[PDB]
Amino acid sequence: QFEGHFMKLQADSNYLLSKEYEELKDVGRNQSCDIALLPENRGKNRYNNILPYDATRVKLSNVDDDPCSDYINASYIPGNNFRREYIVTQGPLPGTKDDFWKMVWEQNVHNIVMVTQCVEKGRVKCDHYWPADQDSLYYGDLILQMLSESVLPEWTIREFKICGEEQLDAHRLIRHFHYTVWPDHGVPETTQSLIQFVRTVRDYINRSPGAGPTVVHCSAGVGRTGTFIALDRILQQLDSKDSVDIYGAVHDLRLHRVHMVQTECQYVYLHQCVRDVLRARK
C-alpha cells in the first residue's frame, strides 16, 4: 500500500510530495525559545536560528551560582515507545563539551548517535568532544575513557566508560555511533547505508532497556538528526505494524524541535528508504 502511495506522491514531478512537505512548515513554530535567547546563554548556541523550545528543552541540574546553568541546546523527542525516547542536540562547542557530558550522565544516556564529521567542506560542524586515545579525561566532574574504537566502511563505533569522580565504582558503558559517509551535498548516495546504520543503532538501543533517551546530533541537530530519528521510527513501524506514517513522524518531530527533517530532499529520502525495504522483501 505504501508503494502506491509513494508513486502518487512522486507523480507530476513530486507535486503531492512537495505539497505534503510544505504543509508541515509552520508546525510547532509558535512556541517560545526565550530561555535559549537569554544573553547568558548566547555563547551556548552554535546557530542563532536553531534554538530549543522552552516547552521541550533538556535541563541540566542547576548550579547554585549561575541561574542559566541549566541550559543546553538540546530537546526531548518522542518515539514509537516513549515520550522522551531521544534527546537531540547540536554538535558540542568547546565551551559546551562539559555540559554535553553532564547531560549524558544526568539523563542516563547509554547510546549516542553522531551523523556528521567534525569538519565538512572546510567548515567546522562539531567539536571533537571525546578522547582521542585510551587515556582517561575529565569533562567537568565526569571521568571519560574510550575503551574501544571500531572503524567500519560507513560508520565508526566507540565504547566509552563514564563515571563521576565521587563514585568510581558506579560507572556506565556508553556506545557512540558515528556515521561518517553523509556526503557534503544532498542525501546519502544509497538508502541501504542509513537503513543499515539505523538498524545497527536500534539493535543496541533494544539491548539497553533501562537506558534513558538516545542522544542524536549532527551539526545543528535538525536535518540529518531528524532524518535519522524519522527513519528509526518508521523502520520499527514497518517491522511491527507493517504500516508506515512518515508525515506523522515528521510532524511529531517538528512539534518538539524546529526544522526536524530540514529539506524536502531528506523527506523524499525517507520515502525511498521505506520503498527499498519493501521492494527487497517482495
Domain of residue 197: give its range: 1-281
Number of domains, the chain: 1
d(CA 50, CA 73) in angstroms, rounded, equals 9
State this model's resolution in angstroms. 2.0
Cβ atoms within 10 Å of 90's Cβ, excluding its own: 26
Torsion-angle region of 242 (φ positive above 0: left; ψ -120 to 50: alpha; else: beta):
left
Work out whether the CA dihedral 198, 143, 116, 79 comes out positive or negative: positive
* 163 belongs to the catalytic site: no
d(CA 177, CA 120) in angstroms, rounded, equals 18
Q: Which three cell numbers stand for residue 105?
A: 550522565
d(CA 281, CA 164) in angstroms, rounded, equals 47
Report the largest interatomic distance among the alpha carbons of the chain, rounded to a whole angstrom: 63
Q: Of residues 68, 218, 265, 273, which has the active-site annotation?
A: 218
Give whole-number Cα distances, 39 to 43, 56, 73, in Å. 8, 20, 14
- Per-residue b or e along 161-173, where b marks 16 or more CB atoms closer than 10 Å to that residue's CB: ebbeeeeeeeeee
User: By C-alpha distance, which of 62, 60, 55 is closest to 72?
Assistant: 60
User: By C-alpha distance, which of 121, 132, 100, 107 is closest to 221?
Assistant: 100
Q: How many residues does the chain have?
A: 282
DSSP-assigned states of every residue in 140-170: TTEEEEEEEEEE-SSEEEEEEEEEESS-TTS
Work out whether the CA dihedral 93, 95, 97, 100 comes out positive or negative: negative
Q: Strand 123-124 vs strand 119-120: parallel, antiparallel, or unpaired?
A: antiparallel
Give whole-number Cα distances, 129 to 76, 99, 136, 207, 246, in Å. 21, 11, 13, 25, 32
Q: Which residues are annotated as a binding site?
A: 184, 218-224, 262
d(CA 112, CA 230) in angstroms, rounded, equals 16
Q: Which three cell numbers stand for residue 170?
A: 558506579
User: By C-alpha distance, which of 262, 214, 221, 218 is closest to 115?
Assistant: 218
CATH of the domain at 157: 3.90.190.10
Q: By the 8 A CB rule, do 254 and 27 touch?
A: yes
Which residue type does 85 have? E
d(CA 253, CA 27) in angstroms, rounded, equals 9
DSSP-assigned states of every residue in the chain: -HHHHHHHHHHHHHHHHHHHHHTTTTTTTTS--TTTTSGGGGGG-S-TT----TTTEEEPPPPSS-TTTTEEEEEEE--SS-TT-EEEEPPPPGGGHHHHHHHHHHTT--EEEE-S-SEETTEE-S---S-SSSS-EEETTEEEEEEEEEE-SSEEEEEEEEEESS-TTS-EEEEEEEE----SSSS-S-HHHHHHHHHHHHHHHHH-TT--PEEEESSSSSHHHHHHHHHHHHHHHHHTTS---HHHHHHHHHHHSTTSS-SHHHHHHHHHHHHHHHHHH-
d(CA 120, CA 192) in angstroms, rounded, equals 22
Cβ atoms within 10 Å of 197's Cβ, excluding its own: 25
CB-based contacts of 47: which residues, under 8 Å, 6+ apart? 90, 220
Q: By the 8 A CB rule, do 215 and 111 touch?
A: yes
Residue 49 has phi, psi (to 5 degrees) of -95, 5
Which residue type does 90 have? Q
**Structure determination technique employed:** X-ray
Torsion-angle region of 140 (φ positive above 0: left; ψ -120 to 50: alpha; else: beta):
left
Q: By the 8 A CB rule, do 275 and 6 touch?
A: yes
User: By C-alpha distance, which of 207, 244, 212 is closest to 76?
Assistant: 212
d(CA 144, CA 203) in angstroms, rounded, equals 24
Q: Which residues are annotated as a binding site for substrate?
A: 184, 218-224, 262
Work out whether the CA dihedral 103, 134, 224, 45 comes out positive or negative: positive
